[model samples]
Target: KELVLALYDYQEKSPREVTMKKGDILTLLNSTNKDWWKVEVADRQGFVPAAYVKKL
Candidate 1:
């Protein structure tokens, strides 16, 4: 799997989402929702806001 890092705190909206802290290194999940991309963090998974989401 590829890697991702939160540039800032990402407070999860859903229970299944992850509370990604600033600079938290996480995993990028497969597939997309046409909006927020699915990401895996600490064994958890959910959508990340594309407006704030970055790719490297």
Candidate 2:
């Protein structure tokens, strides 16, 4: 629904994963996955672990 902040450095290991640093701002796209969220940052779109971020 809004921007989300990464809580840690999530190393992307697959195409579905999104790599980001702690405190990075991500544009929220979708939350269809039970454990992953669709997001975008710097024009790159991918999925990030739900537990790795917090709504802002």
TM-score of each candidate?
Answer: 0.69, 0.88
Weakest 10 consecutive residues of candidate 2 by summed lDDT = 11-20
lDDT of 2 by residue, 32-53 (tens): 7789998886678899889899
Clashes of each: 0, 0
Query: Residues 1-56, candidate 1, lDDT per residue (tens digit)?
Result: 77877777889888655667777677788546666767877877887765455565
Off by over 4 Å in 2: none
Candidate 2 has an lDDT of 0.87
For candidate 1, which ten residues in a row score worst on lDDT? Answer: 47-56
Query: What overall lDDT goes with each candidate model?
Result: 0.71, 0.87
Off by over 4 Å in 1: 31-34
Clashing pairs in 2: none
